[PDB]
Design a protein around this ligand. Structure first.
Ligand SMILES: *[C@@H]1O[C@H](CO)[C@@H](O)[C@H](O)[C@H]1NC(C)=O
Ligand SMILES: *[C@@H]1O[C@H](CO)[C@@H](O)[C@H](O)[C@H]1NC(C)=O
Ligand SMILES: *[C@@H]1O[C@H](CO)[C@@H](O)[C@H](O)[C@H]1NC(C)=O
Ligand SMILES: *[C@H]1O[C@H](CO)[C@@H](O)[C@H](O)[C@H]1NC(C)=O
Length: 272
């Protein structure tokens, strides 16, 4: 029967009763790192985050090796509560900026990251620690910088590229920066690779670096938690509905549904 299956929708997503966050030009990852279009998303919370097909990044060219996993982690958690922290950044210059990441017409950078360069032509071996003495877990986002040329590498860090090691008592992550010119993006042949690390209470964050480090300014709180993300170009209207799809919201009364596999909230079984 067809009275058991739902096939239609208004085409709109209803803004109630689930907290929906429309990304517009921004991906979740960009709102996390702090891309300048995405400054309004700071410390926002949500039950469902909606990515758009038109989304574009407009900052430093970067890649995230474990993109999906990170995008999914932060998704479930459903918060961007960030906390600034006082790292001991001695011996280095802070707040590097780029003409590729524009903010108020001035060269800037990802709001949540800290680009360290040499100070007086020295870049000491960093041995900096940040303990989690809190009750909850801390989520730290950091990166490694891959300059286009050796000339840039010496300009920025005053020595050749060496290993970056981010470890805790439970794990260790080690990256080797790779000097090499990758195709220009926003006139930038350099790249940044994004990595992440979770620190449990009583555990400690340990950073080891001789350059190429793109440092965190602090941590996000990690829930997880049942929130989510859906890729959809569907418009948003004012209404109430418990079940949302990428083709729009639908009512939750039939046992089945053939509009789309992906749903959030109290929904029918997909059938087809
Ligand atoms: C969305 O992206 C377009 C393309 O560059 C841009 O013109 C527009 O300003 C962006 N929207 C806003 C206001 O963030
Ligand atoms: C930061 O690092 C230096 C060298 O390791 C140390 O001597 C200094 O006391 C530190 N500053 C703070 C506030 O811990
Ligand atoms: C670095 O930038 C942040 C905000 O971008 C600012 O609050 C801080 O004072 C800056 N640090 C230094 C030492 O300039
Ligand atoms: C961190 O990394 C380097 C390269 O492996 C290592 O030689 C150095 O001793 C380490 N620093 C600390 C804090 O042990």
């Amino acid at each position: 029967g067809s009275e058991l299956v739902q096939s239609s929708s208004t085409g709109e997503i209803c803004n109630s009763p689930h907290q929906i966050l429309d990304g517009e030009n921004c991906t979740l990852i960009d709102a996390l790192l702090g891309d300048p279009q995405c400054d309004g998303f700071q410390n926002k919370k949500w039950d469902l985050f909606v990515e758009r097909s038109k989304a574009h990044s407009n900052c430093y060219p970067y890649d995230v090796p474990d993109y999906a996993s990170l995008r999914s982690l932060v998704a479930s958690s459903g918060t961007l509560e960030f906390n600034n922290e006082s790292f001991n950044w001695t011996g280095v210059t802070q707040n590097g900026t780029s003409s590729a990441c524009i903010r108020r017409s001035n060269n800037s950078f990802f709001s949540r990251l800290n680009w360290l360069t040499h100070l007086n032509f020295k870049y000491p071996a960093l041995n900096v620690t940040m303990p989690n003495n809190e009750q909850f877990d801390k989520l730290y986002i950091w990166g490694v910088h891959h300059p286009g040329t050796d000339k840039d590498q010496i300009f920025l860090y005053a020595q050749a590229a060496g290993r970056i090691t981010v470890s805790t008592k439970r794990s260790q992550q080690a990256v080797i920066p790779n000097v090499g010119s990758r195709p220009r993006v926003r006139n930038i042949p350099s790249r940044v690779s994004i990595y992440w690390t979770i620190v449990k209470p009583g555990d400690i964050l340990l950073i080891n670096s001789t350059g190429n480090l793109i440092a965190p300014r602090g941590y996000f709180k990690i829930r997880s938690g049942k929130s989510s993300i859906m890729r959809s170009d569907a418009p948003i209207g004012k209404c109430n509905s418990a079940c949302i799809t990428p083709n729009g919201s639908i009512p939750n009364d039939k046992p089945f549904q053939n509009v789309n596999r992906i749903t959030y909230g109290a929904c029918p079984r997909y059938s087809k």
